[PDB]
Chain A
Amino acid sequence: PKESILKKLEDIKPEQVKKQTKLFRIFEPRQLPVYRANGEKELRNRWYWKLKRDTLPDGDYDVREYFLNLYDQVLTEMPDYLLLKDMAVENKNSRDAGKVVDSETAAICDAIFQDEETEGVVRRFIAEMRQRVQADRNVVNYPSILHPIDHAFNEYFLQHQLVEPLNNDIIFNYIPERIRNDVNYILNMDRNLPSTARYIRPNLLQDRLNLHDNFESLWDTITTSNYILARSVVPDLKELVSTEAQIQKMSQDLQLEALTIQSETQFLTGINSQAANDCFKTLIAAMLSQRTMSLDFVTTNYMSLISGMWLLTVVPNDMFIRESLVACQLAIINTIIYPAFGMQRMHYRNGDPQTPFQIAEQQIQNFQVANWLHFVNNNQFRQVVIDGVLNQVLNDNIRNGHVVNQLMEALMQLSRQQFPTMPVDYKRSIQRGILLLSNRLGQLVDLTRLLAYNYETLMACITMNMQHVQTLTTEKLQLTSVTSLCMLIGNATVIPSPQTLFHYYNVNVNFHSNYNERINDAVAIITAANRLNLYQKKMKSIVEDFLKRLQIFDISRVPDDQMYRLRDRLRLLPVEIRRLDIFNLILMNMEQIERASDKIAQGVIIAYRDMQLERDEMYGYVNIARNLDGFQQINLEELMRTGDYAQITNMLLNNQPVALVGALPFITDSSVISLVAKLDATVFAQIVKLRKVDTLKPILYKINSDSNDFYLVANYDWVPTSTTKVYKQIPQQFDFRASMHMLTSNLTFTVYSDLLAFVSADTVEPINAVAFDNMRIMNEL
């Protein structure tokens, strides 16, 4: 299960570059007939804008759901770049053998070229519309035939496409400054890239959610994920001192009974490797991930208490978890420090604001140990923002290792004391146990500097700000695994390879970019749901999708409340520019799409007045209305939320004029006999008996010569009068020239997604590797 998590993490591919092959379209021209006034039918037809894919449901809430789904469609098509030549096609009737943007555009132009019933000007206009280029600027201008809303979307995709001109400097500038200014690494490349090239920048915008503020269940997983990731990139300790050639030197230094090696008198327990590397890995990965780590040691083992000093010095104390270092500090005080001056054992309190080193700093009177404990107690991280990212940084004295000199001073003093209260064997045991560290001093100094160096070097490869916040789950640390590291080490430097660094940086970048991008998705749909009044919609499955695309959680066992709080925070986030503009371009045209679409209607008037029909021309006479002025209106989604058919029933029994507003179906009726008989007034009686309003289908009285009884109109001198009109707009008329536009684009660029693959990178020889202070690390011998 450990390796599986890293398999999921390290299989995070970057954000897949989008590239469309066609243009977003909702509309298309279409030949309908045209019925000359008085009703009869022309031999000629006419083009009109009609909708691709009439699929709108019934009811207004469902229509707003449709436009939300359409917004989702537009986002999925919403590209990152585009080259119009890849969709361009020939024009089969162009004077200059030009081209046009879409296949359907060419089909339109070649179908309109063939009809008898087209002006000569439009045929000329089609012969003279062509592409153009200006290659000094790498710019192209293609013709296009587009509904205005479609032109709006496509033009937005042109002008707001995320690319940046690529060069050889941005490659360098994409790396953080610290690595470039660290002389232990050398970078180069074997290719120059032109200015025709491109590259996409990740979204490295910091946490908009503050998941380190009361999202502890998520922050635990995140911190564990970054910890286990960090374990996969910390270097292995390539070279050590042998584990038996050391232990015999240690044993003779300790003067132990023969063949106690296999019993391991507690000094010698867990000295091995397979623990030293484990400690080296754990400390660095935790401090990078900011993950709290707990300690499992033994009190019989005095070397564990001794190596906890080095640990609690080189590492801040607010980085551990409280009870563990409380136990460890207590043990240290009770059996190394207070016994070295005849002090009492201790009287420590469980729920005490202070840790034993704090309450010990003031009691004992020795300068060395006092100032050591002062340093320990007041060691803590320093928050600082560098390259945009917050960072928890060390003191700048731990780094250029001299803390170990204070440690040696304190320990040497304690060696120099006498233990009056206690026997000779006890004194002997303790003083030998700390001599075993004194003899390893220079190697410890080098170790400290190496940890500090690798820590800051890996800190450089971080994109998400790193807060110092406690976590649910911890990481165990046996101190025998410290003692091993502190005792099996010497003249063996380990520098992270540059490729591991670049890997870690790209992994974190891709994770961060994915994070921001999916945030932007969720924010768009949430904001849209709140501004489109979608009230029956439970904003959970969106959040399920959001958490699933971050491929580390288990959504099957995370509750609904955390999701809803996450929604509550997401409510208060500004929408990014792309999504916001596309939504405000949709809020201003959803209705104009909804005025179209012959499957729903925007209302029905019931006005007891023998009203005249309108001389439209795609129909003849129709019972249509386009303003909804005068009469008072009744919203139907209100009535279908709250069934109160009292008002409307009162209004129907008293034959009162009214309008009804809401997406309503309709049925075309090409019978004149349904007009004088007034069947459209027969539809609203089922609303008072069975109070549902779902099977409501008004009539549209389309009249024309195609009606089989039209002759009456053309024989008896009566204009068609009627009752109970319908609230609907007419389609707009297709003007070929005014519908034509010129679409701009860049000519023939190339988009490079990965950005550090062109960098080849190398390390100075790690024996002669140097830190910030212009002073070598791994130099003590």
Chain B
Amino acid sequence: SHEDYLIARELIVLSYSNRSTLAKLVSSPMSILVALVDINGTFITNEELELEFSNKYVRAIVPDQTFDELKQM
């Protein structure tokens, strides 16, 4: 896809020099991003591979300073 080309061209050309602070960089914001996605429909666990889905909706009460952190990142 197109986005694959953009991503691959943008990592291949920078991974030729940066080799210590690159995968650590782009893989770090994800930990914040997961706190932004509203649940509409859910999965549960009972015993180690059981599921029992739930139509529960949950909003995303994210504070403001983590956006400033994310912005710095």
Binding site for B on A (CB under 8 A): 2-3, 6-7, 10, 228, 231-233, 236-237, 240, 242-244, 272-274, 276-278, 281
Contacts and interface: CB of A to CB of B under 8 A. Distances in A.
Contact of A232 (B51, B52, B55): B55
Contacts of A274: 50-53
A231 B41 CA distance: 10
Contacts of B56: 232-233, 236
Interface string B33-69: 0000000110010110011111111000000000000
Nearest to A230: B55
Contact of B50 (A3, A10, A233, A243): A243
B57 A243 contact: no
Contacts of A2: 41, 55
A276 B51 CA distance: 10
Contacts of B46: 237, 240, 242-243, 273
A275 to B, nearest CB: 8
A231 B54 CA distance: 8
B55 A281 contact: yes
Contact of B55 (A228, A237, A240, A244): A228
Contact of B52 (A233, A244, A277): A277
A237 B52 contact: yes
Nearest to A276: B52
Contacts of A3: 40-41, 55
A10 B51 CA distance: 25
Contacts of B57: 6-7, 10, 232
A231 B55 contact: yes
Name the residue in B47, B52, B54 with the highest tally of chain A Cβ atoms < 10 Å from its Cβ. B52
The 8 closest A-B pairs by CB, nearest first: A277-B52, A231-B55, A232-B55, A3-B40, A273-B50, A242-B47, A3-B41, A273-B52
Given A243-B46, A243-B47, A6 B53 contact: no
Given A240-B46, A243-B46, A243-B47, A277 B40 contact: no
Contacts of B53: 274, 277-278
Interface residues of B, number: 13
Contact of A7 (B40, B47, B51, B52): B40
Contacts of A6: 40, 55, 57
A258 B8 CA distance: 54
B55 A273 contact: no
A89 B29 CA distance: 51
Nearest to A277: B52
Contacts of B40: 3, 6-7
Contacts of A240: 46-47
Nearest to A484: B52
A272 B46 CA distance: 11
B65 to A, nearest CB: 23
Name the residue in B40, B44, B51, B55 with the highest tally of chain A Cβ atoms < 10 Å from its Cβ. B55
Given A232-B54, A236-B52, A277-B53, 17 more contacts: A2-B55, A3-B40, A6-B57, A228-B55, A231-B55, A232-B57, A233-B56, A236-B56, A240-B47, A242-B47, A243-B46, A243-B50, A244-B47, A273-B50, A274-B50, A276-B52, A277-B52
Contacts of A10: 57
A675 B57 CA distance: 79
B22 to A, nearest CB: 36
28 contacts: A2-B55, A3-B40, A3-B41, A3-B55, A6-B55, A6-B57, A7-B40, A10-B57, A228-B55, A232-B56, A232-B57, A236-B52, A236-B54, A236-B56, A237-B52, A240-B47, A242-B46, A243-B50, A272-B50, A273-B50, A273-B51, A273-B52, A274-B51, A274-B52, A277-B44, A277-B53, A278-B53, A281-B54
A273 B40 CA distance: 21
Name the residue in B41, B46, B47 with the highest tally of chain A Cβ atoms < 10 Å from its Cβ. B46
Contacts of A233: 56
B3 to A, nearest CB: 25
A470 B67 CA distance: 50
